[PDB]
Design a binder for this molecule. Structure first.
Ligand SMILES: [Cu+2]
Ligand SMILES: [Cu+2]
Ligand SMILES: [Cu+2]
Lengths: 209, 231
């Protein structure tokens, strides 16, 4: 079988700059194919036969390489070019390289929300931590319950990159039984991010306004 | 104009099979191989197989052998060869098969083979789950107990299947809103939250209502979000 290894996993650039994406094949001498998949859109053939442009593909896309080492270059990239790019040989695919928009570092504003009294009546407590309008997307959210670090009982969700300001937002939801929720007092979300000189904690005390 | 049009999204129970259609037009259907490929969350593309419509010859991915059955319907009038329908039936489904499935076809290159896919169907989402349809419970994410920026929201919990739509104040509030992609919980039910940031000074003057719609259960909820009642 053939293995195709793409790099980098994520490339962060601005419109007008030039993007270089790499796809390495485990076997030499086969032609390379590239696809573009914009978020939520049908995949699109970009390059075939290593350097040939598919229908409607502008000349700023350049496919190149040979042997085992293949490249997709996007010259003076357009805002429409932020997407995931995949290489292919026969039935075999790379795992994709994502082109995302670079911007200045932005620390997240952080908010914590207690479970509502309505939900608690049902036997479950959801505690939510919001990280708003930050860049880059990498962030660490740690839940603490009376300073005990939580593991295995939270789920995160991250928005698509904002089309105007290029930031991300993120939620983390901690799920507890009502019984467990009522056993402890201090509920805290600790956030680590490149824009923060030290981690930021937001917290509330159960039963306290 | 080559066109490939697939059947719609579907929910399937574990152990069942799904038959997806690919209605082709704009070229002689008997003369090109139709391929199938799926895009799997966290794993990428996986080629499924191909079918050559003339005689129905097929080739399936070795690791999927037994799970795949491709068939086709040909035009029976030789006056009218430029359409056909290809089918891909995928059996023994498990939640790992939740993915977006595509019929694809090569372009104009006569020497490049059948794998460089110029033409794509629009995709068919298949969700494999044992869960039953269920409308969401909507709970407030209440603004923290200033004059500055406050955050508030709605937690939309325990619904199946996707999707839910959320608006604020019947679409009058859009700036600062973030409606997060849903997460699948260990229960097999989805959950998401929708939040908005606003000036703190507006919390006593402005009403904030999230409008939650879950068409699969025809659930519609309007939840007013306000500061929690304190002593
Ligand atoms: Cu483009
Ligand atoms: Cu405690
Ligand atoms: Cu925001």
């Amino acid at each position: 079988e053939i293995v195709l290894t793409q790099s980098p996993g994520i490339l962060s650039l601005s419109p007008g700059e030039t993007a270089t994406l790499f796809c390495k094949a485990s076997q030499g001498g086969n032609a390379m194919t590239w696809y573009q998949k914009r978020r939520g859109q049908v995949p699109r053939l970009l390059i075939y036969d290593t350097s040939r442009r598919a229908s409607g593909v502008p000349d700023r896309f350049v496919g190149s390489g040979s042997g085992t080492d293949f490249f997709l270059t996007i010259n003076k990239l357009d805002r429409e070019d932020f997407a995931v790019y995949y290489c292919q040989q026969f039935e075999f695919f790379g795992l994709g390289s994502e082109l995302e928009v670079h911007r200045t570092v932005a620390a997240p504003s952080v908010f914590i929300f207690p479970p509502s009294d309505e939900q608690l009546k049902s036997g479950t407590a959801s505690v939510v931590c919001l990280l708003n309008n930050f860049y880059p997307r990498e962030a660490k959210v740690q839940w603490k319950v009376d300073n005990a670090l939580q593991s295995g009982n939270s789920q995160e969700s991250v928005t698509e990159q904002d089309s105007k300001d290029s930031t991300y937002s993120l939620s983390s939801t901690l799920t507890l039984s009502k019984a467990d929720y009522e056993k402890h007092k201090v509920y805290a979300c600790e956030v680590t991010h490149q824009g923060l000189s030290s981690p930021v904690t937001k917290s509330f005390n159960r039963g306290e306004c | 104009q080559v066109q490939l049009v697939q059947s719609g999204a579907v929910i399937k129970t574990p152990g069942s099979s799904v038959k997806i259609s690919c209605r082709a037009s704009g070229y002689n259907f008997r003369d090109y191989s139709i391929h199938w490929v799926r895009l799997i969350p966290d794993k990428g593309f996986e080629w499924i197989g191909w079918i050559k419509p003339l005689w129905g010859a097929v080739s399936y991915a070795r690791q999927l052998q037994g799970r795949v059955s491709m068939t086709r319907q040909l035009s029976q009038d030789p006056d009218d060869p430029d359409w056909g329908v290809a089918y891909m039936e995928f059996s023994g489904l498990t939640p790992a098969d939740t993915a977006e499935y595509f019929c694809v076809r090569r372009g104009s290159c006569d020497y490049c083979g059948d794998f460089p896919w110029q033409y794509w169907g629009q995709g068919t989402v298949v969700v494999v789950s044992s869960a039953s349809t269920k409308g969401p419970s909507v709970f407030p994410l209440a603004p923290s107990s200033s004059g500055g920026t406050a955050a508030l929201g709605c937690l939309v919990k325990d619904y199946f299947p996707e999707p839910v739509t959320v608006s604020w104040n019947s679409g009058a509030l859009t700036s600062g809103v973030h409606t997060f992609p849903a997460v699948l919980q260990s229960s097999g039910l989805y959950s998401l939250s929708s939040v908005v940031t606003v000036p703190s000074s507006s919390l006593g003057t402005q009403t904030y209502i999230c409008n939650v719609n879950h068409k699969p259960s025809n659930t519609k909820v309007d939840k007013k979000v306000e500061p929690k009642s304190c002593d």
